[PDB]
Scaffold this motif. Structure first.
Motif, short mmCIF file in Angstrom:
data_model
loop_
_atom_site.label_atom_id
_atom_site.label_comp_id
_atom_site.label_asym_id
_atom_site.label_seq_id
_atom_site.Cartn_x
_atom_site.Cartn_y
_atom_site.Cartn_z
N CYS B 30 0.83 -1.21 0.00
CA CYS B 30 0.00 0.00 0.00
C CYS B 30 0.87 1.26 0.00
O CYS B 30 0.46 2.33 -0.50
CB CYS B 30 -0.88 0.01 1.24
N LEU B 31 2.05 1.14 0.59
CA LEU B 31 3.02 2.21 0.61
C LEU B 31 3.52 2.51 -0.79
O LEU B 31 3.51 3.66 -1.23
CB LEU B 31 4.21 1.84 1.51
N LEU B 32 3.97 1.49 -1.49
CA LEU B 32 4.64 1.77 -2.72
C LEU B 32 3.63 2.00 -3.84
O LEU B 32 3.93 2.68 -4.83
CB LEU B 32 5.77 0.77 -3.03
N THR B 94 -8.66 2.33 -1.30
CA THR B 94 -10.04 2.74 -1.01
C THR B 94 -10.73 1.87 0.04
O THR B 94 -10.37 0.70 0.22
CB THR B 94 -10.89 2.74 -2.30
N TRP B 95 -11.69 2.46 0.75
CA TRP B 95 -12.47 1.78 1.79
C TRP B 95 -13.91 2.25 1.75
O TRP B 95 -14.21 3.41 2.10
CB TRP B 95 -11.88 2.07 3.17
N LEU B 272 -9.25 -2.06 -0.36
CA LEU B 272 -9.42 -2.26 -1.80
C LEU B 272 -8.38 -1.49 -2.60
O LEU B 272 -8.13 -0.32 -2.30
CB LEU B 272 -10.80 -1.79 -2.26
N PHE B 273 -7.86 -2.11 -3.66
CA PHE B 273 -6.82 -1.50 -4.49
C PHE B 273 -7.28 -1.28 -5.93
O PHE B 273 -7.80 -2.18 -6.57
CB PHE B 273 -5.59 -2.39 -4.50
N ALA B 285 -3.34 -12.93 -4.93
CA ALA B 285 -2.36 -13.63 -5.76
C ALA B 285 -2.51 -13.19 -7.21
O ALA B 285 -1.54 -13.21 -7.98
CB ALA B 285 -2.50 -15.14 -5.63
N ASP B 286 -3.70 -12.80 -7.60
CA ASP B 286 -3.88 -12.19 -8.91
C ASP B 286 -3.41 -10.70 -8.90
O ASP B 286 -2.65 -10.27 -9.76
CB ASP B 286 -5.34 -12.34 -9.38
N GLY B 287 -3.82 -9.97 -7.86
CA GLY B 287 -3.65 -8.51 -7.82
C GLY B 287 -2.25 -7.99 -7.48
O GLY B 287 -1.89 -6.87 -7.85
#
Lengths: 334, 334
Positions: B30-32, B94-95, B272-273, B285-287
């Protein structure tokens, strides 16, 4: 198309020519009253701890000065310094209406931001601002805050009055920084959508020292926002009257701001002074001499004789002061 | 005695130990992700016009760095720079709950303030902060924002969600600056009495670019207010529950904030990304591979190969990054 409340402010600040000797002569005394109140605050470690830059050792080219110090800061952190000082002890000028407030609080924004522009002009070989342009902004800033406050009470909806300082300062400082109609319209609209402090800190059982600095945080906020406008940052046209989202619906219970009279020279002419009635507009021949001594006593408390003298020489004459470049006056107070 | 809502934050931030490998491993990505979003914003002159210091040419001793530049600012101005960059294009994490928000926005406050304390320590021959302390603040700041947002909807009251960024950042930052129980308690209470931005700018017919920077203004506001606390500035104990004047009465229609579950590692685990579902917690594992390319593409667009490489060498390994001193990492981004 912009809310007609915002237009009436923008046009007043841009185009209105003050022609009242009585308003300028009173502006003159309100300036040096307020400045001395600030000087007196410096005695108090609760004030001082909140002053200076964010990070000691910062260097800001041609940066705005804080009286009673040798600090020179960015116009935003300079405005909060001056604002907080002048309002700290609750001894500065006053306006009681539907809403109760202190129109002198706007000096911080106007004066920090006028010193900075002057030091920059002078460094670029251009012509600086004059101390007459600062009374003029002070007169206008008293007007906008004070006239809205006549019939509109923000305390019956839970908000602090410093809201009207945010607004007034953003309007005269944007001007001022030399912005376009459209840009000043954007800057004021940004003020209204901003967030507004509660007044929890003003009432038992939470009464606390944010009662002293809330206004200084507003006038500084005004200057931050005006400079955003300077970039080209867009405005929000229906900021007051927008359905559901606008200010009237969210914060003023669906009601409209109702302004009885048009903006002029009315507030600075009739302002109240804490110079122990005497501090009233009709008794100014009794109260003006009492004011000069208050100003005299306060200079004595940060400055030695010679300095307190050489400040008093320029300041106690309305012409002379008017004509003097703002960078050169504020130097006198280092 | 302080509102129990504020105590539960202060104690969580002070005393809680995260034990969830899954929370740290996600914090790492989430940082990078967020950092690369910020780099991409620099393509856009609307963003860039809002950045830099207030007054070009200022020098701040040991000042906090802005990635993708050579700027070094005070930790307040640095937080707004980073905040505004990472949220600008609406591509950060996002949340979605009762309230919709972006918990990564708190990186600005936490990171600008963490680089500054490190530089700083290192100048005084003391030991700096570590990149692990920043995932840890990021985890805690997701938690506080995200848990209050589960059931409490601030949009049905007219206010912008960035309110919870103000609060979350103030809390973790104050802790990071090393303040006492009493002082964090004061800082957080100061956040609640502050003023809260409307959401006028988010809706037709006023939709505008304050939608991009409102959050970055909050996290910066958080840092300004924590450093006030640092002076000894008092708090306001019944800031929420005070009759007439408190927050519940003025802004939340007399109702109480209702928090369903206790604070832990719950939000960062399930965040959520936007890595075009794939961006869900179950499909990591997909994302995750899709995320690394997004990060890779974005480095390419401000940095040349060698630099891109040497940033990628430290960053893509969780240990190695964890152990690295934050001043040193962020130097990689100049």
């Amino acid at each position: 198309d912009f809310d007609r409340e915002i237009v009436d402010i923008v046009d007043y600040v841009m185009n209105y020519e003050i022609t009242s000797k009585v308003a300028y002569d009173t502006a003159h005394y309100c300036l040096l009253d307020t400045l001395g109140c600030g000087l007196e605050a410096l005695e108090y470690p609760a004030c001082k701890k909140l002053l200076g830059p964010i990070v000691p050792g910062t260097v800001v080219p041609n940066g705005a000065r804080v009286p009673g110090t040798q600090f020179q800061l960015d116009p935003v952190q300079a405005a909060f310094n001056i604002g907080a000082m002048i309002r700290w002890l609750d001894f500065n000028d006053t306006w009681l209406a539907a809403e109760w407030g202190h129109p002198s609080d706007n000096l911080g924004g106007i004066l920090a931001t006028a010193d900075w522009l002057s030091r920059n002009a002078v460094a670029a070989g251009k012509a600086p601002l004059t101390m007459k342009q600062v009374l003029s902004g002070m007169i206008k800033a008293h007007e906008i805050q004070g006239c809205i406050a006549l019939e509109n009470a923000f305390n019956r909806v839970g908000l602090d009055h410093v809201l009207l300082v945010k607004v007034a300062s953003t309007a005269v400082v944007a001007e001022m920084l030399g912005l376009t109609r459209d840009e000043i319209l954007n800057a004021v609209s940004l003020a209204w959508v901003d967030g507004q402090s509660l007044r929890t800190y003003r009432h038992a059982p939470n009464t606390g020292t944010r009662k002293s600095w809330a206004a200084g945080d507003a006038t500084s906020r005004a200057v931050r926002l005006a400079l955003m406008a300077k970039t080209g940052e867009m405005g929000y046209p229906s900021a007051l009257t927008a359905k559901t989202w606008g200010f009237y619906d969210v914060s003023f219970k669906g009601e409209t701001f109702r302004f009885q009279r048009p903006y002029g020279s009315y507030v600075m002419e009739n302002v109240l002074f804490k110079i122990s009635p005497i501090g009233h507009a009709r008794r100014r021949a009794d109260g003006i001499p009492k004011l000069i001594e208050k100003f005299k006593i306060n200079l004595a408390r940060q400055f030695p004789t010679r300095q307190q003298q050489r400040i008093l020489d320029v300041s106690l004459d309305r012409a002379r002061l008017e004509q003097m470049p703002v960078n050169e006056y504020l130097d006198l107070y280092v």
